[PDB]
Amino acid sequence: IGVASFAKAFPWHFITDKRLELVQLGAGFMRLFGTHLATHGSSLGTYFRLLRPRGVPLDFREILKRVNTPFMFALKMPGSTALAEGLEIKGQMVFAAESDSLLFVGSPFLDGL
Numbered sequence: 001i002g003v004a005s006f007a008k009a010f011p012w013h014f015i016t017d018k019r020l021e022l023v024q025l026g027a028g029f030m031r032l033f034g035t036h037l038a039t040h041g042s043s044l045g046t047y048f049r050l051l052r053p054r055g056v057p058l059d060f061r062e063i064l065k066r067v068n069t070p071f072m073f074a075l076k077m078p079g080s081t082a083l084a085e086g087l088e089i090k091g092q093m094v095f096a097a098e099s100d101s102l103l104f105v106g107s108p109f110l111d112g113l
Contacts, residue, residue, distance in 0.1 A: 003096045003103055010105045012089055018060050018100045020044040028108070032087075036078040048073045051088065063102065067095045071104060088112065 004024055007013045011028035022042040025034065033040075033047055040046050045058045052072035056062050072090045077083070091106020 003094075003099065003101055007103055007105065012091070012107055013103065013105045014044070014048075015104075016044055016060075016102045020058060020060055020063075020102075022047075023101070032075065032084055033078055040078050047076055047078075049076055052090075060102070063093065064095055067093050067102075071106070072109070073104070073106075086112075 004015060007015055007024060007026065011026045013024075013026035014022055014029060015024040017023055020043065022037075022044055025037075029047075048058075050056055050058055050063075050071070051074055053066050053069050056066055070090065071093045072088060075084055075087045075089070077085045077087075088109040088111075089106040090109045091104055094103045094105070095101070096103060
């Protein structure tokens with residue numbers, strides 16, 4: 001199965017290219033900020049803050065070096081939204097070498113909501 005088709009089984013996923021531009025978003029994230037992609041762009045850092053692994057810049061090469069540890073992201077909601085701002089998503093990152101893609105697959109973490 002291709003990486004993009006695999007990812008579609010997961011509502012909480014994203015796929016980026018090698019510049020960390022989003023090329024696919026799962027249904028969960030599309031619900032939360034899909035409306036804003038046209039106006040706010042497709043840069044991963046526009047919508048996500050990297051929480052874990054700690055102290056890792058949002059840079060393809062640096063993420064790729066740590067691709068084997070668990071990842072956690074907090075959302076940056078467009079507009080004024082105390083509600084999903086800082087919603088946490090824990091999961092795993094996988095590198096697809098054929099296409100130079102990064103896949104994140106996760107699930108929301110409700111312990112601080």
